[PDB]
């Protein structure tokens, strides 16, 4: 019956969703800026809904605990009825597609390698054949799972190393992985999605680089709880925004117009 | 009730589906080879179905006639109940998504420019600012529609020219667009999807090139008639094949392992 305010789950991840410098001065949706802030606004406009942005409580993307089988992160928020829609850099994966609905992708990505500039690494193959430079991934998302599940020898070799490396190569947020790259003197490499990698490469201090090709190819989709009547209009909206070049415009705005490291 | 042989519609388009050299010697599905032949086999295996490959009668992707409102091509074949599934380089678009179901993409692409080697053209912007080199697109697919619908000035300028150009810049098949590039002495440029462009670039006589960036970003999806119970298992199969690197393997097989123009 009565339309209600749509509860949007998302995550603080640059440049998708960030607190404005002056957020303490602001209320509600106006506290945040970014690619997914703009995208939420476009989708809401095209679908005729009022919405509230909320940051996922546990600060995670979404993984199911192997013992409890409880979903955390934004996925768990959709699954347990805490949010109506996730509008974030949330990777489309088989295990997630089984439990939530995903629009067609609104952005493509692959897993990629971030280095401190001058690091003697060009590929995953380079990483796997050496021990001097540590490397790891984010917890509780699609990248860690990629390695954990991979039957490809190079990626199996990598996973075998990372899962038992000491101290831990895994980080809780993208910002911590980036900080580790910068602070580790070339002795840590970070495995993260190319979208995130390419953003950070254009931010001061301009000391990191994306090296080599992407290890996989895939995309982010807008997720809804399974069978939600939001799914259909939201998917049509993503296709429309795609076809109008709105998605390209937003990407240019937040990646390259914001570039700090040159033209 | 009783499972039946799934009727697959597809299109003869290199290197997705081609007649084997010795096809007259062969029967059924064995007449054809290609990326979508292999993909049909993987999907069928993962979904537990028997299938028949058939080439779309009219040799078109799919467009709705503005007066009759009748769909042609593979789309029309799904819509009118002539085929159960399309497994082809069929672009996910808003207008098609409204009338058929699409899996998540199994391959990404954008619109791109093919030139005869040495043609003084580097971008769509170059094409739009000149009259010496003609350019056009395929009929009855997503590329023509991109230009017809675009509010972006460069692409509106292009569309204005192409729709009234004499003789016609439009072609009935990819092979005819390619032949026109090769046979036109640098005086014709072809707008086609990057996947197709990149394949042809690696085929003898090795006289064409992809120039500049892609004009858009999108993907091919496996299409089913709207509400078909095939859609769910097929989508899960595409994600699984993606995540196993089967899609990457097939792309390498048909594009680059088949390369004729060097390493
Ligand atoms: C193994 N590889 C060869 C296959 C790669 N595979 C893909 O192309 C692919 C994706 N490709 C894209 O998202 C590219 N894309 N597609 C669209 C669409 F709407 F038309 F579908 C859009 C984009 C990016 C921009 C927005 C609109 S997402 C995704 C996959 C594999 C399964 C996991 C999720
Ligand atoms: N986009 C990823 C998070 C980042 C990563 O795993 O690298 C996900 O949805 O899990
Ligand atoms: N993949 C396109 C056909 C080729 C093109 O338009 O360039 C479609 O599904 O319509």
Curated annotation (Swiss-Prot), chains A, B:
Marked site, Crucial to convey clamshell closure to channel opening, at: 121
UniProt-annotated location(s): Cell membrane; Postsynaptic cell membrane; Postsynaptic density membrane
Q: So where does L-glutamate get bound?
A: 89, 91, 96, 142-143, 193
Could you tell me in which tissues this protein is expressed? Answer: Detected in forebrain. Detected in dendrites of neuronal cells. Expressed in the pyramidal cell layers of CA1 and CA3 and in the granule cell layer of the dentate gyrus.
Sites marked Interaction with the cone snail toxin Con-ikot-ikot: 64, 148, 240
The recorded induction information for this protein reads: Down-regulated in the pyramidal cell layer of CA1 in the hippocampus by global ischemia.
Post-translational modification comment from the UniProt entry = Palmitoylated. Depalmitoylated upon L-glutamate stimulation.
Extracellular domain ranges by topology: 120-262
Location of Phosphoserine modifications: 150, 184
Q: List the disulfide bonds.
A: 206-261
Glycosylation site residues: 3
The UniProt record's further free-text remark is:
The postsynaptic actions of L-glutamate are mediated by a variety of receptors that are named according to their selective agonists. This receptor binds AMPA (quisqualate) > L-glutamate > kainate.
Quaternary context: Homotetramer or heterotetramer of pore-forming glutamate receptor subunits. Tetramers may be formed by the dimerization of dimers. May interact with MPP4. Forms a ternary complex with GRIP1 and CSPG4. Interacts with ATAD1 in an ATP-dependent manner. ATAD1-catalyzed ATP hydrolysis disrupts binding to ATAD1 and to GRIP1 and leads to AMPAR complex disassembly. Interacts with GRIP2. Interacts with GRIP1. Interacts with NSF via its C-terminus. Interacts with CACNG2, PICK1 and GRIP2. Interacts with GRIA1 and SYNDIG1. Part of a complex containing GRIA2, NSF and NAPA and/or NAPB.
This chain's function reads: Ionotropic glutamate receptor that functions as a ligand-gated cation channel, gated by L-glutamate and glutamatergic agonists such as alpha-amino-3-hydroxy-5-methyl-4-isoxazolepropionic acid (AMPA), quisqualic acid, and kainic acid. L-glutamate acts as an excitatory neurotransmitter at many synapses in the central nervous system and plays an important role in fast excitatory synaptic transmission.
For domains, the record's comment is: The M4 transmembrane segment mediates tetramerization and is required for cell surface expression.
Q: Which family does it belong to?
A: Belongs to the glutamate-gated ion channel (TC 1.A.10.1) family. GRIA2 subfamily.
What is the protein's given name? Glutamate receptor 2
Q: Which organism is it from?
A: Rattus norvegicus
């Amino acid at each position: 019956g009565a339309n209600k305010t749509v509860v949007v789950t998302t995550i603080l991840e640059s440049p998708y969703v960030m607190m404005k410098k002056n957020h303490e001065m602001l209320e509600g949706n106006e506290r945040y800026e970014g690619y997914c802030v703009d995208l939420a606004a476009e989708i809401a406009k095209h679908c005729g809904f009022k919405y509230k942005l909320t940051i996922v409580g546990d600060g995670k993307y979404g993984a199911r605990d192997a013992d409890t089988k409880i979903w955390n992160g934004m996925v768990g928020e959709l699954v347990y009825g805490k949010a109506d829609i996730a509008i974030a850099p949330l990777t489309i994966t088989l295990v997630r597609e089984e439990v939530i609905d995903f629009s067609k992708p609104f952005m493509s990505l692959g897993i990629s390698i971030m280095i401190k500039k001058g690091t003697p690494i060009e590929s995953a193959e380079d990483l796997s054949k050496q021990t001097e430079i540590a490397y790891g991934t984010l917890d509780s998302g699609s990248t860690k799972e990629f390695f954990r599940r991979s039957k490809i020898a190079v990626f199996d070799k990598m996973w075998t190393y990372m899962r038992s490396a000491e101290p831990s190569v895994f980080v809780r947020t993208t910002a911590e992985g980036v900080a580790r790259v910068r602070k580790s003197k070339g002795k840590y490499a970070y495995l993260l999605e190319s979208t995130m990698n390419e953003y950070i490469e254009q931010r001061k201090p301009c000391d990191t680089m994306k090296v080599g090709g992407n290890l996989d190819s895939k995309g982010y989709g807008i997720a809804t709880p399974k069978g939600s009547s939001l799914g259909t209009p939201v998917n049509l909206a993503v296709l429309k925004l795609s076809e109008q070049g709105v998605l390209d415009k937003l990407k240019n705005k937040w990646w390259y117009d914001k570039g700090e490291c040159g033209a």
